[PDB]
Ligand binder design. Sequence first.
Ligand SMILES: Nc1ncnc2c1ncn2[C@@H]1O[C@@H]2COP(=O)(O)O[C@H]2[C@H]1O
Ligand SMILES: Nc1ncnc2c1ncn2[C@@H]1O[C@@H]2COP(=O)(O)O[C@H]2[C@H]1O
Lengths: 205, 202
Amino acid sequence: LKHLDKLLAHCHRRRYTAKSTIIYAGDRCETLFFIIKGSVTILIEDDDGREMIIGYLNSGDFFGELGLFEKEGSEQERSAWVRAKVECEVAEISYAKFRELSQQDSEILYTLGSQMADRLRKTTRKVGDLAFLDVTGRVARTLLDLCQQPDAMTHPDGMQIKITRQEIGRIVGCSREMVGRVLKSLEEQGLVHVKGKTMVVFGTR
Amino acid sequence: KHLDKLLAHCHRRRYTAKSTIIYAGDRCETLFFIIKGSVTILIEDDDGREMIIGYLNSGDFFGELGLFEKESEQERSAWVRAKVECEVAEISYAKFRELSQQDSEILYTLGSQMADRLRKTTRKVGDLAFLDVTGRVARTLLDLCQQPDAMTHPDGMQIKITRNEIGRIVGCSREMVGRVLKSLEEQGLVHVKGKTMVVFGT
Ligand SMILES: Nc1ncnc2c1ncn2[C@@H]1O[C@@H]2COP(=O)(O)O[C@H]2[C@H]1O
Ligand SMILES: Nc1ncnc2c1ncn2[C@@H]1O[C@@H]2COP(=O)(O)O[C@H]2[C@H]1O
């Protein structure tokens, strides 16, 4: 991504502590972000106003990019909340500067497009998971999927991931008590071992 | 500015209603653009149950989600089925990547369509959270009642739809839809009368 060098030269670096909200859904859109270090959580509210975790983005990912685009070329609003998952260092750049550099080098838009396409694939699969799987299947699939994503650690017996019961519940759309019951069953069946802030998922190497 | 500009390098093909244009799991090698018509986007579970993700219309590209992997080429992420007769422009990824190298305008159009699809599909995720199949079918029936192909009825609204079609909207089997409809009749929401259904209230 050497073609991003000229974009990062015009970025202001900001640090966000874990759990701090970077983007609030519904806000105006004038700024694009690039994750230098750390990771962020993408959240929406369901129709009950209850929060659901859509996914995570990691170093090398842009976020806040969808606000560049609108159907009639009118004002656009932030489509989700973005919250630091761990301590994050982000590069912030105005839409106005991004537009000038992307007009100078379309490779920047190829990188942005590649990331948006990946997110659309993942979110489309999430529709299927919510429709096709019951909660036990959704919890198991979430655990397996997280083992293949950044910040999973190779473990002698599988992969180790940084996640809590509450987070899994917000990902799969069930109660915090229900995820406890499901995870207990999955532990007894040999898929997972739950720890304080981490979980070990067996058979994922 | 590039409509005839891009079509100048495109093959034009026609697809009749219900034809599959893209099969999920195939190699991505071709970008499509709808000159006229509309398509349905569908996914499946590992048992062949189908679910509709959404629709694309005249002016929409599709088959684009493998286009930006210049690196490792992707598989088609969904089925694309012609909803009506479609006139489509087609261009290989190879030729498009060369033509678009200094074309930020065309990449911005592709990005804008992907952004629209990401927002809509994210809202669809939110609308599915905490909704079991019976609630999904009920909401679909109420939604179908507000569409222009519905008919008013003394007791409410009358719709024409098959269990197969309901199952594709909610992502379940035809048999499961049948069981749900029997439950919604016992609830008092609907009366199934062969090929049509009456939805009470609304
Ligand atoms: N389904 C999704 N997957 C990944 N990231 C998303 C998703 N929906 C929204 N976002 C991100 O959240 C951001 C919120 O602000 P924007 O709409 O500007 O840009 C959005 C994307 O960067
Ligand atoms: N969530 C979605 N919304 C709209 N269109 C989609 C969605 N998911 C996949 N598609 C389209 O279906 C196509 C299938 O092949 P591709 O993955 O190459 O590109 C895909 C997109 O054009």
